[PDB]
Design a protein around this nucleic acid. Sequence first.
DNA 1: ACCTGGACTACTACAACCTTCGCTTTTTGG
DNA 2: TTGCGAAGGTTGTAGTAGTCCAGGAAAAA
Lengths: 1076, 99, 312
Amino acid sequence: MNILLVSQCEKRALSETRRILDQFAERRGERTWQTPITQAGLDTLRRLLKKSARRNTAVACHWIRGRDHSELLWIVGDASRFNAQGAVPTNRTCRDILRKEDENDWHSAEDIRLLTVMAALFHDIGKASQAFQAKLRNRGKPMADAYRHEWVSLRLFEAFVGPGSSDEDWLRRLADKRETGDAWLSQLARDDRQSAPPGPFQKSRLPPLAQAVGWLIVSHHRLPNGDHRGSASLARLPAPIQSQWCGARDADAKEKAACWQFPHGLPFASAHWRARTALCAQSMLERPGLLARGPALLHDSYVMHVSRLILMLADHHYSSLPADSRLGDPNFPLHANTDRDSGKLKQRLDEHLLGVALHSRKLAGTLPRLERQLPRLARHKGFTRRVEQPRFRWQDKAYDCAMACREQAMEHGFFGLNLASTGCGKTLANGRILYALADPQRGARFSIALGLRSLTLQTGQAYRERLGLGDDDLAILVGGSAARELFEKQQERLERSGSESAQELLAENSHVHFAGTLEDGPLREWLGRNSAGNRLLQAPILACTIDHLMPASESLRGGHQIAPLLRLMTSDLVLDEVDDFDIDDLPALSRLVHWAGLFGSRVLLSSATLPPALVQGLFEAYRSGREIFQRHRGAPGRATEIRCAWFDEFSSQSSAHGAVTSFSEAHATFVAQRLAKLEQLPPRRQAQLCTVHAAGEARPALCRELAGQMNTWMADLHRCHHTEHQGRRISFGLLRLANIEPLIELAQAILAQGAPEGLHVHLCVYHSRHPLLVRSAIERQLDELLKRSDDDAAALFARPTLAKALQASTERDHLFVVLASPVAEVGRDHDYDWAIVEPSSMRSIIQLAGRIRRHRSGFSGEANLYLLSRNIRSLEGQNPAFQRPGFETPDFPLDSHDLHDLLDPALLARIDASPRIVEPFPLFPRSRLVDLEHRRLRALMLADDPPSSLLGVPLWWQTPASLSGALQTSQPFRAGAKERCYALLPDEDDEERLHFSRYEEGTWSNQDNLLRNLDLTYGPRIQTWGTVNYREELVAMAGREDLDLRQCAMRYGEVRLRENTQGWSYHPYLGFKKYN
Amino acid sequence: MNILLVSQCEKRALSETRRILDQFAERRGERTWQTPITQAGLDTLRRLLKKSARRNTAVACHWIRGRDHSELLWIVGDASRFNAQGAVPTNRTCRDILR
Amino acid sequence: LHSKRANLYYLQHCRVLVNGGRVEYVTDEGRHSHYWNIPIANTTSLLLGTGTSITQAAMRELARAGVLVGFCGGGGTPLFSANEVDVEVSWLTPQSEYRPTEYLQRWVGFWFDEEKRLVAARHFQRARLERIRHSWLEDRVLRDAGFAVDATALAVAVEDSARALEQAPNHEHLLTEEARLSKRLFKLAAQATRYGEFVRAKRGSGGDPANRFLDHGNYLAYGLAATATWVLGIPHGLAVLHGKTRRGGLVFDVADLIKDSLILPQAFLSAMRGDEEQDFRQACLDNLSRAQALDFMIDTLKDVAQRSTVSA
DNA sequence: ACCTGGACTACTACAACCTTCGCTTTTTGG
DNA sequence: TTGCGAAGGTTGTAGTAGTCCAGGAAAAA
C-alpha cells in the first residue's frame, strides 16, 4: 500500500516528527512524505509517533486505496488542524465575518407585533362612554359600572367591522384614510335591550383575524369565566363567550341605557390616531399570506399568550407615566384616567392609545435580545472541580453524561430525572448537571423550586453553601404566596380612577434577597428601577417555592403572571420534591410543566419516590408543549424527539424518545435495573409495629395515656441504642406527628409528666405555626447541632451547647428529642439515633426512615424505628382516617385502618423506595396503602375516569381551553379554608409593647383582644433546648438588615393561621395554640 | 488517475501558484494538493501554470500509476529544487563540507 | 425598475436578510432606502448587482411568497445565474405560488413550420430597420453628440435594404441582405465620425479602439437579451433566424434588434474622444436605459407570438 | 590534525491587521 | 448602525543556518 503523510506540527514538535518519519519515507516536501509501505510498518510508525508526541503534534495519513479513491486512516496528535476529510484551512482570522447576531429566528415576531399593535390602538376605546366620563368626574359615592369598559370596546369594534364580512373588507375600509363617518354605529347591537343579541364570537359574526384581535381587546384585564363547563363547548372556544362571562354586573335599566351613549363622538376624529390605524392596516394587508393564516393563529396558544403578555406589560407601564401634550390632538375633550393623588384628569384618550401602541411596538423588538443581554453565570470552578470522595463519584458520572447529551438537548429539548437516594446530596448534582448542559462560552441560567409552602431564609443560605455561590449570584425569594382576596378591596377602591393597570406585579410581603448588578437591565424601563421584578429577572440563579411560579399559568386576574412568565422564557427550571404535592394539586403542576415546555425551557424533576403514572403524565405534557414551540422557533421541519435521561447513584443513561410508550418502556427498564442493584445493600434500619392503648376518645386523656406509653418506649429504646463518652450516654430522638393541635397537646402533656427515672430529657418543639424568624432561628440551631459522623464522641461532646447542658447536670443519661411536624420531611439534613413515626402515608414512612443513621454506618440489628399501629385520627373515630394529609377518600375507602393488616410484614425488615417506584400487579386498593396510592395516581394522571371531576388533564392542550379561565376553577390549586396573616408588632411609640395585629388591606389593625397568655408546668429532670428569644432575634435581624425594627417585624415576623372566633393562646416555646 | 502536487515556490510566485492550483484540488497541507483528475484537465492545469509562471515558480506532479509504484510527470519552473526522482533536499549549507 | 412591463427591480450595495420573519435590507441610507417599497408578491422579480449577498432564510421567505431571484452584473448586464420559469398547460398543475408562463407553447406551435419561421425572420428584420432610422435620425441628443449622420445616404441605404428584405425567398438571401446593410451602415458611420477606414476583425483580433468598443457593446447587448428571454420564458436554443445548429441563436437574434441602433454610434464617439473603458461602459448603460431597450425587446417578442396565433 | 549535539546568535520569509477606493473584466463566432 | 474585495503599508513571529565549545553511550533468554 502507498500512503501520503503530512505534518502540521510547530516548534520543537516539528523536529521530532521529522526525525521519526524520515526513517520510513523519502521527503517529497518540506512537510510531506510518500512511499509504499506494508501494514506492519504503518502500525509501528503509529506507535512510535504516539509514544513521543507532544501538544503541538498533528500528522495525518492518507491511503490511496485504488482508482479515483483515497481515504483518511488516522490523525496523531491535535485533531483541530484538519477537518473530517483531512483537508487543512487556507487562512485564519479573528475578526468575525459571519456576523450572525443580526439575524434572529423568531419566525412569528412580525405577526405578534401586528396583532398587538392593532389590539393596542383599540383596547381602551370604551372609555369614551358618558357613564365612564361621569364616573371620572364624579367625586361622590361610586357606583360600579353596569358594563366593563373592555366589553364596550369589544361591542364598538364588532359594530365597526360589520358582521359576516371577510377580513379584507374591513381591513381595506380602515386603511382608507379618506373614509370617515359615524354611519356604522347603527349596527351597535346593545346588550341592554330586552332581546339579548348573539355573542360577538359566533361563526357568522366575525372573521378569524377579527376574533383574534377581539380576544386581546376583551381579555386585557381579566380572563373570561362563565359557569358552563361542558367539554363539548370547550373545544368550540372562543365561541360561547357572552356578556355574562365578562363580569356584566346586574343593575337598573337607567344605568344600562346610560352606558351605551356616546355624546362626544369617537376617537376617529383625531388625525394622528386615524393615520396610525391606517398605517397599521396597510402593513397588515401587505404581509405575505397573513390572511389565510387567521384560523390557524386563532387556535394557537403560544402566539396569543405572548401577545397578551406584551400588551399587558406595555399597558401597565404607560398608565403610570405623567401627562404629555405632544401626542394626539392637544384639544381633544375626552380623557382616559385621572391622577391617583390629585384626582385630576391626566391623559387624553387618543394620547393614551397612541402611547400604548408605541410602547408595544418598541418592546416587541426587545424580547429576542433578552437571551443575549441578560446576566449569566459562567466559568464557575465549583461545578467543574472533580470530587475525591468515592461516595461522590456518581455525581461525576452524571456530569459527564450531561456533556455527552448536551448537543442534541439544545436542539430537541430535555426531560431529566434524578432518583438518587436520600443522603447523596442531590443539590450539588442538580447544579452541576444543569450547568454542564448550558453552552460554556455564554454561561448558564436556571431556577430551583421546592414543594414547600414557605421558604425560610436559612434554607436558601444552605442552598448557597451546598452550591458554593456568593451572595452576588443567587437570589432568594423568602416568604410564601399571598391570598387572592386581599388585593380585591384596594382594586375596587382603585377602580374609581380607571388605573387598574398600575397594580404592582408582585405582592408587598415578598422580598428578593440579592445585592448584585442592577443597572444594565435591558428591561429596566418597564419593570421598574428597583421593583422586585427587575431584581428577580437579573439574578442568574434563583431559589423559590413552586407557589411563586405557579401564577404563570394559574393567574385569573390582574397582571400577576408577567414576571414569572418572563423568568420561564429566559431561563430553565428544576423541580424538587415534586411528589410532596397533594394529590389534588397535581393538575396545576401538570399545567405549569406544559407551559414550561411550551416556551423553550428544559425541565428536570428530582426525587426518590416517583410513581410511574406521574412521570408518564408529566412527560406527555412536556412533549405536547414542546411540539408547539418548535413550530415558531428554530429550523422548521425538524422532528420532535425529546432527549430523556435517568440519573441516580449507581449508573446513568440517556436516550431520545418521541412517544409515550417508548419512554414508558425505557423508564420501566431503568427502574427494574435500579431495584436489582439496590437489593444487594445491607439494611441500616429495622422498623416495628407498636400497639397503642386507648380507653377514651377524649383528646386530653388520650394524650396523657399516649405520653405515658411514650415515656416507657423512650426509656427502652434509649437503653437499646446510645452513644457513650467517659461514662456518659446521650442520644437524639424524633417524634413525628400529623397535625399541629395534637402535636402541641402532646408536648404539653410530656412536659407535665416529666422524664423517667435515671434519665434527663431535652425537648424542642418545632412546627410551622411559629413566627417565621423564630422558625428560621430554630432551624439554624437544629442544623448546627445535628451533624453526625463516625468515632466523633469527643468532637460532638466538645460542642458548646452540649458541653454546657452536660456540665450543669447530675444525671448520667440524657435524652434529646425533636418533637417535629411534617415540616421535618423536606430539606432537613439531620441524623437521629432513633425515631417514632405516626402513620399517614407511605411517602412519609420512607422519608422519615431515611433520616435514621443518615451519616453513621454500621448497625446493631436492633429495632430503632417504632410505628404506631393506628394514627391519631383513627383513635378519634374519624372516617376516613388517612386524610389531611393522606389519600383515603370516600371514593377510595379502606376496609381496616389498623397498620397490622395494611402493611406487608416482609417490608418491616427493609424499608426503602422499592415499594413506591414500581406498580404491583394486581392492585388491591382496599387492603394495601401503596395499592391505593398507585390506583389514585393512575386514575387521575393518565386514565380517563378522574374521580369527582371526569375532566381529563389533557384537556389543557387538546382543546382551546386556555383562552378562557375554566379549567383553573374546576381543578383549583391549594383550595380549602382561607387563611389570614398575623404578626406580633411592637407599638409605634413603645417598642416594649407588642401588639397582636391582623393584616388588613395594606394596614395592620390592632387585634389585641384576640390573644391570650398560656402557662406552663414542668416536671423532674426535664428542660427545653433550641428555643429562641423573639424580641432579641428581631433586634438582631433588624441590625443585620440595617432596617427599622418595626419594618423588620412587618417583613419577617409574619405568621399564618386559620380563622377562629375565640382567638388563640401563645407561648414563645410552643407557638400559637388554638383556643375555644 | 489521482495525482499529488507539491509546490516549492518562493516569494511572489507562491501566491500565483496557490491561486491557480486551488481551482482544481483540495489542500492537504501548506504546499500539498491531491485529488483525482482526467488527462485533459491535467493538461489545462500545466498550460495555465506555464503561461503565468515566474522565475521562482517550482511545481511538481506525481502520478500513482498503480499498486506500490509511482512516477514523476513534469516540473514547471526551476528543477534545481527537486532531484531526478522528485524528492527535495532536507537542508542546505553555504559552508563546504564535502572537501 | 428596468422595465414597467416586466416589474423587475435591481438591488446594489445591500445585504438581504430576515429578522423575525420579514426580509430586511441593510444599506447606507438606513431606513430611508427605497428598497422598502418593493411589493413582495407573485408579480415581482429581484436582480442583485454589485456588492450584494443573500441568506438562505431570505430565499426561503422569497420562495414562500413566490418571487424569482437572479444575480446580474454591474449595472444590470450581463446575467450570470437565476431561477427558471415553469410552463403552463392543462396537465402539469402543481400547487405553488410561482406564476407560470404560456409563451413557450405558442412559440413551439410554429417553430416547426418553415414558412412561419420565415415570417418571423421578416418581422425581426423589419423591426431592426425601423429602429435604425429612429436612432440615427430623430435622436436630438445624438445629434448634439457630434457624429453627423447624412440623411440622404442613410435613407437610400434603409430604403434599399427594405426593398431587398421584402424580396428574400430563402434564409440565405436574408442573411446576405443583412450583411450588406451592416456593411453599408458601418461605412456611413465611419464617414460621419472621420475615423477613417474600419473593419470588423474576426476573433476580436482588431487592435484599434473601435474593435474593442464594438466587442464590449456586443457583450452588454447579449446580456440584456438573455435577461429578456429569461423574463419571458422562452429557451435560448430555439433560434428563429440563425441556423438550427448555432447555439444561443435566439439571444443574438433578439440582441440584434438594438445593437446596430444603439452600440454603433457610441463606440465611434468614444474612440473619437479616446475615453477609457469604464466611461464607455457607463455611457452605453445610460443610453440603453434612456432608450428603454428591454421594454422594446419584450414587446416585440410577445408581438411575434400574438401575430402567429392570430393568423393561425 | 576526527566527528555530532547543544546553546547562542543573527536575520530574513511569511502571515495578519489597518486604511482607503473603485465598482470592470478578453469578452467572438457566434 | 454602516456593501464587497483589492492593493499598499506596517507589525510580529517562526524558522533557518553560522559560530564555538565539549564529549566522546545503548544495558540477554
